């Protein structure tokens, strides 16, 4: 395990990344993953890593964040990597190209990425048919503790944002264990304004009504994914709305439009969302605040700068029931998944926790 980890991180990934533009490297990764061209996921998930949340069993708490598999092309390969859950998307109602290239930038000195993809999406119909082709295979995976999330976006030219999300609920809701109302992309104009109170309550009411109209076996959990750049007022309002409406959970956080002091990469001043190590603590602190504002009663999926067991446990202790990563995979490759899981298990034992469940929100009880 540690053999593969070292070779991937120290030699293979830096070599491959030095040969390819970042978007090409992304596209090839999706293709390789969809073909199962992957190292052995050596790590056996232990009972200590199981989590029950959102109406589902999760064999382990480490998921792939939205953005890697935007169009649902690599789901089975991502489970083969050892992820305990997979989130696809964002998916928009109609197909759209996204922003002009280049739109992805590597900051290897910062272990960070900046992206401005702009919701490049195959669209709901294409993704629906892709997920339908493996719908019963997914039902068995979910029963076995490997749930699927679908992240919903909106088209660039839409006039009625709530209608775009409602279309996504109707089309992909029946194929998902959970849905994500992504109101926090930094790369669609006006999108993050949907996080404001009046707009959010109206939007989320419509989303929940649509979800509630699906047949029981086809009725997903609904989560809201938020930015790391919210004001204190915005956070208080989101918390209020989520509790009022009975939203099932939060994903905390998307990428940041901030540029923390100390970034070294030449491309630091590119427009887009920043991910990876510089986002880590900003995300952990957003988890911590959202957990407090919701009384620990709203499950949180914690995301932003996770590349180790320690990073995962810090998010869990701050309030996350589950975590996701993406950017670390770009530097470490597939062995990062088993690395995080092994390190997390070790730390849980070292800190006296019986399993992940016992550590959720543990910092708030100090
Ligand atoms: C943010 C966009 N973005 C970038 C650029 O910022 N990189 N990236 C990415 C690339 C890769 C690559 C490429 C280098 C490939 F494909 F060109 F080699 C291989 N592999 C891999 C290795 C060994 C075996 C099986 C795979 C899939 C990965 O896991 C992987 C993951 C990734 F997230 C990615 O999504
Ligand atoms: C290239 C790229 C594309 C992304 N696209 C999406 C997206 O379509 N929808 C979404 O909710 N989040 C998207 N994200 C955000 C990630 O899901 C995640 O919230 C963020 O990158 C923080 O995690 P990380 O530091 O582990 O990458 C994307 C991130 C990256 C790097
Ligand atoms: O498509 C993108 O640009 C994208 C969407 C999102 O939600 N987050 C992100 O960092 N990029
Ligand atoms: Cl680059
Ligand atoms: Cl169906
Ligand atoms: Cl920006």
Characterise this structure.
The chain is an alpha/beta fold and 366 residues long. It is built from 13 helices and 13 strands. The protein has a single domain, classed as Alpha-Beta Barrel (TIM Barrel), CATH 3.20.20.70. It has an eight-stranded parallel β-barrel, surrounded by five helices. It has a three-stranded antiparallel β-sheet with strand order 5-6-11, with no helix packed on it. Strand 5 and strand 6 form a beta hairpin. Helix 4 runs parallel beside helix 6, helix 9 packs parallel to helix 10 and helix 10 packs across helix 12. Orotic acid binds next to loops. Monomer. Pathway: Pyrimidine metabolism; UMP biosynthesis via de novo pathway; orotate from (S)-dihydroorotate (quinone route): step 1/1. It is found in: Mitochondrion inner membrane.
Radius of gyration, taken over Cα atoms and rounded to an integer in Å: 19 Å
Give the distance, in angstroms, between the N- and C-terminal Cα atoms. 35 Å
The biggest sheet, with number of strands, parallel, antiparallel or mixed sense and barrel status, is:
8 strands, parallel, barrel
Total number of domains:
1
Under the CATH scheme, which class? Alpha Beta
Give the name of the CATH superfamily.
Aldolase class I
- The number of helical runs is 13
Tell me what portion of residues adopts beta-strand conformation. 15-25%
Strand segment tally: 13
Helix content: 40-55%
Structural class by helix and strand composition: alpha/beta
Largest sheet strand order: 3-4-7-8-9-10-12-13
SSE sequence, one letter per element:
HHEEEHEEEHHEHEHEHEEHEHEHHH
- CATH structural fold name: TIM Barrel
CATH hierarchy: architecture: Alpha-Beta Barrel
Overall, the morphology is globular
Bound molecules: the ligand CCn1c(CO)nn(-c2cc3c([C@@H](C)C(F)(F)F)cn(-c4ccccc4C)c(=O)c3cc2F)c1=O, flavin mononucleotide, orotic acid, chloride ion
GO cellular component, one term: cytosol
Function: Catalyzes the conversion of dihydroorotate to orotate with quinone as electron acceptor. Required for UMP biosynthesis via de novo pathway.
Subunit structure: Monomer.
Membrane topology: Single-pass membrane protein
């Amino acid at each position: 395990a540690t053999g593969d980890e070292r070779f991937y991180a120290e030699h293979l990934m830096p070599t491959l990344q030095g040969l390819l533009d970042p978007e090409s490297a992304h596209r090839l990764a999706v293709r390789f993953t969809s073909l199962g061209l992957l190292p052995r996921a050596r790590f056996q998930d232990s009972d200590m890593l199981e989590v029950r949340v959102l109406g589902h069993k999760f064999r382990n708490p480490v998921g792939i964040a939205a953005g890697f598999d935007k169009h649902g092309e690599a789901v089975d390969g991502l489970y083969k990597m050892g992820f305990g859950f997979v989130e696809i998307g964002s998916v928009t109602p109609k197909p759209q190209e996204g922003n002009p290239r280049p739109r992805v930038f590597r900051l290897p000195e910062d272990q960070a990425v900046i992206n401005r993809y702009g919701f490049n999406s195959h669209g709901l119909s294409v993704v629906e048919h892709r997920l339908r082709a493996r719908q019963q295979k997914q039902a068995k995976l979910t029963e076995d503790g490997l749930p699927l999330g679908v992240n919903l976006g909106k088209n660039k030219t839409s006039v009625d944002a709530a209608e775009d999300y409602a279309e996504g609920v109707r089309v992909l809701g029946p194929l998902a264990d959970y849905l994500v109302v992504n109101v926090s992309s930094p790369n669609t104009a006006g999108l993050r304004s949907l996080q404001g109170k009046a707009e959010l309550r109206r939007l989320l009411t419509k989303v929940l009504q649509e979800r509630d109209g699906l047949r029981r076996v086809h009725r997903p959990a609904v989560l809201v994914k938020i930015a790391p750049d919210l004001t204190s007022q915005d956070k208080e309002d989101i918390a209020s709305v989520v509790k009022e409406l009975g939203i099932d959970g939060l994903i905390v956080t998307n990428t940041t439009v901030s540029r923390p002091a100390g970034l070294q990469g030449a491309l630091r001043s590119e427009t887009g969302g920043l991910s990876g190590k510089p986002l880590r603590d900003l995300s952990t602190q957003t988890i911590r605040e959202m957990y407090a504002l919701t009384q620990g009663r709203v499950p949180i999926i914690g995301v932003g700068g996770v590349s180790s067991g320690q990073d995962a446990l810090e998010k869990i202790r701050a309030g996350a029931s589950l975590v996701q990563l993406y950017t670390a995979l770009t530097f470490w490759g597939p062995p990062v998944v088993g690395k995080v899981k092994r390190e997390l298990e070790a730390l849980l034992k070292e800190q006296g926790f019986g399993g992940v469940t016992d550590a959720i929100g543990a910092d708030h009880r100090r």
